[PDB]
Design a protein around this ligand. Sequence first.
Ligand SMILES: NC(=O)c1cn([C@@H]2O[C@H](CO)[C@@H](O)[C@H]2O)c2ncnc(N)c12
Length: 390
Amino acid sequence: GSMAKAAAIGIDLGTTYSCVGVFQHGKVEIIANDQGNRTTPSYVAFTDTERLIGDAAKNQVALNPQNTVFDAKRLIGRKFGDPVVQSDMKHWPFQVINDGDKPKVQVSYKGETKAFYPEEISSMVLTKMKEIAEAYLGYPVTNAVITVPAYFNDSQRQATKDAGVIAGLNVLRIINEPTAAAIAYGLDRTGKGERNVLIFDLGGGTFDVSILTIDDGIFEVKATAGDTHLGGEDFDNRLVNHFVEEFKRKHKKDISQNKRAVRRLRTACERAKRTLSSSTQASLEIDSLFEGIDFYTSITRARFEELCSDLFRSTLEPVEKALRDAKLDKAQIHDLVLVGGSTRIPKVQKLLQDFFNGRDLNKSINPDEAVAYGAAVQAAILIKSTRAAA
Ligand SMILES: NC(=O)c1cn([C@@H]2O[C@H](CO)[C@@H](O)[C@H]2O)c2ncnc(N)c12
């Protein structure tokens, strides 16, 4: 007996990006994919000859927008008639169809028109995450913990389980994303006594605030609030609009109707935005942006902060609402935890810190990786099968 047990994995199945971890040697290792990325795009692309997942899918999205699927998490476990589904559909270049009041994404794939349920798309992203972990560990992986937003209902939770089952994974448990982040910091291991934790999660296109109470390791969701369409992509959008205007001023030319030029500008803006989190200024250099014209410029952190100022400030309204719902005062919150890559922005950090009167923020665990980190800690706990000693 007792053949060595394979490690279990923790998976953050994100709306835009996914992340996979494993707890081994008393620590969590976040596993990079073969392109060296510690997070993988939650994208699936279909061609006449291939099914591409992750980076390979995201990198060819520009010329194949109708057959490159993303945001399947926004559809999972929902009815076609759902108001959220009907509004979201207007922004996606891929076709969403009605099959018995259940949404399906329809594409061209290997010579035919094919339709997939959201949980089938998410199963393909989970298959990639499983492979990434198997490439590192050097053996097949069976068991996994998968996370969902705290506001997901039974239907959304069940459809996530089905996605794992289709991917060949045994789903140990479905756990809330905010709870997973708390586990990553060991906020459930402080012993006896009530502890109030606020999770501030600002991602690529969504913003969630969660208030939890932890008592003797037991978690309770006290409040959930947020902005459904607020994130990093809105900051990229303000920089795009600023530079479109700057090009018009300097060259008397409007670039906005050339999809390639706008796309190249946005990619450069997102990269400059990241630089501005560690540097006071950033340069933006694009060769032959429009009509053979090179675009060599810069932006200060102050100007970027001014451009996105209203958006950054608006992150505090869901913080006040969640506190109102949880029936708590700011002082009462013991721990503040930052999740999502956009929380690296100094101005965002400052606004939250000042709102909580100079309190330290838990941000030592990479914000992009904290949810998968916590999922990996819980997965290792779940597969334990100790028989009590005499
Ligand atoms: N990993 C990083 O250093 C960063 C990722 N984002 C954004 O976080 C979101 C999820 O990756 C996207 O909108 C990114 O642009 C960032 N935004 C600002 N500063 C940063 N340093 C990052």
